[PDB]
């Protein structure tokens, strides 16, 4: 009854950050030593808990959120951070408890001529609330006049493509990010460690 963290990290395809994928973990035992001992991760930052004792704790609800972002934007997946990705695509609460894991995926998500299948939200009316997902593709009115469904003067499409090319710098190369959120409620803690 091992927790299926394998199909999250080892998944062939990842989702866009604006449409970040979420997997629910329940009724299993999780061996976190497989994760924090593997040096295949560029960033591994845990808030409210360190990974070493994660094998001795039990939680009620675990969420694994997978997406792909820019390298120089991995710093934005953290509590109390501001920026395009944090404010408009994926927000973390200031009281976040859990881990953020990110690794370079240039060999998998980049292609010659540009990979444009990954999108991110550029504009929004208000900052994103934590863990809230917005997949609306309506025209963003940037001020005085409305848009009527067309772009142009102060009227832009909310989503923009990333354009991942393999010869780009580490700051432009794609990175795959998994956010493990641990939640303790007045509900039975179904996940545990060995």
């Amino acid at each position: 009854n091992l927790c299926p963290f394998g199909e999250v990290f080892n998944a062939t395809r990842f989702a866009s950050v604006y449409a970040w994928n979420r997997k629910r973990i329940s009724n299993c035992v999780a061996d976190y030593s497989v994760l924090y001992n593997s040096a295949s991760f560029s960033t591994f930052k845990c808030y409210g808990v360190s990974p070493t004792k994660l094998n001795d704790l039990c939680f009620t609800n675990v969420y694994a959120d997978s997406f792909v972002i820019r390298g120089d934007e991995v710093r934005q997946i953290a509590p109390g951070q501001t920026g395009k990705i944090a404010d408009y695509n994926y927000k973390l609460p200031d009281d976040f408890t859990g881990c953020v894991i990110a690794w370079n995926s240039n060999n998998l998500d980049s292609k010659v001529g540009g990979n444009y299948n990954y999108l991110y939200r550029l504009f929004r009316k208000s900052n994103l609330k934590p863990f809230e997902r917005d997949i609306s593709t309506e025209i963003y009115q940037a001020g005085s006049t409305p848009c009527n469904g067309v772009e142009g003067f102060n009227c832009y499409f909310p989503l923009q493509s990333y354009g991942f090319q393999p010869t780009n710098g580490v700051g432009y190369q794609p990175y795959r990010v998994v956010v493990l959120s641990f939640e303790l409620l007045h509900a039975p803690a179904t996940v545990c460690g060995p």
Partner: antibody
Framework: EVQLVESGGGLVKPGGSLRLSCAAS????????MNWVRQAPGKGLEWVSS????????YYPDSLKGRFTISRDSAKNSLYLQMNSLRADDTAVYYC?????????????????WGQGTLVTVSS | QPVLTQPPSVSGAPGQRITISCTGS?????????VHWYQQLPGTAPKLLIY???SRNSGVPDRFSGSKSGTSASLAITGLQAEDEADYYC????????????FGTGTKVTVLG
């Protein structure tokens, strides 16, 4: 159209600190990576530092031991390099440079445009 | 800090073709990163001459060409002229955050005649 002008070079004592400035014009400043490179008199080129378009990610080589700091200011479209614990080996002509566009295939890989450069001489 | 090795100087008559080599490792050129060539005239700042390991910057004559293969790259000048006397540097990229931009040794080009 693209213009990069450096300033602040001069004399500094060994172990001292200096601040080099680079004003940029002719392009959207906040859309490009910025870089600092240096060339010792009669020697080759050495990349010194790099900063992203948003200015929140900084990159340095391990040889500098983190005594160099790169910063950018969009309110003035300027790039700043702070050098600390300077030594005689750091005497060189320093150039600020603009990287390739994020739309291109070599974003954050080279130095498309260069400045006039400024001479920094570390001497007692 | 690793570098890219080039011949210290290459010379030729002002009618022939010369080549400048640029040897890298599996970490910079063999890792899938292109090579840029910069030309520095005496007393002036370096200028971008070649980007993408084959493409010519604006204002660069067709006499200059670039190529890369394996862990190495080359810059070819056909029809040497007296204005070509300068320093030529190759440059590539390393994925490691401790290296990143890797510069070439530099080559002094001179014309004879």
């Amino acid at each position: 159209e693209v213009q990069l002008v450096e300033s602040g070079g001069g004399l500094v004592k060994p172990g001292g600190s200096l601040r080099l400035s680079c004003a940029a014009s002719g392009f959207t400043f906040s859309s490009y990576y910025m870089n600092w490179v240096r060339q010792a008199p009669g020697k080759g080129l050495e990349w010194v530092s790099s900063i992203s378009e948003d200015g929140y990610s900084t990159y340095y080589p391990d040889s500098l031991k983190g005594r160099f700091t790169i910063s950018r200011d969009s309110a003035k479209n300027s790039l700043y390099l702070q050098m600390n614990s300077l030594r005689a080996d750091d005497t060189a002509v320093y150039y600020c440079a603009r990287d390739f566009s994020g739309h291109t295939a070599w974003a954050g890989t080279g130095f498309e445009y260069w400045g006039q450069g400024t001479l920094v001489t570390v001497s007692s | 800090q690793p570098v890219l090795t080039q011949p210290p100087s290459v010379s030729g008559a002002p009618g022939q073709r010369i080549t400048i080599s640029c040897t890298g490792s599996s970490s910079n050129i063999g890792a899938g990163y292109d090579v840029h060539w910069y030309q520095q005239l005496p007393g002036t700042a370096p200028k971008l001459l070649i980007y993408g390991s084959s493409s010519r910057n604006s204002g660069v004559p067709d006499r200059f060409s670039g190529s890369k293969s394996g862990t190495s790259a080359s810059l070819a000048i056909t029809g040497l002229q007296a204005e070509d006397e300068a320093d030529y540097y190759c440059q590539s990229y390393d994925s490691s955050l401790s290296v990143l931009y890797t510069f070439g040794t530099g080559t002094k080009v001179t014309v004879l005649g």
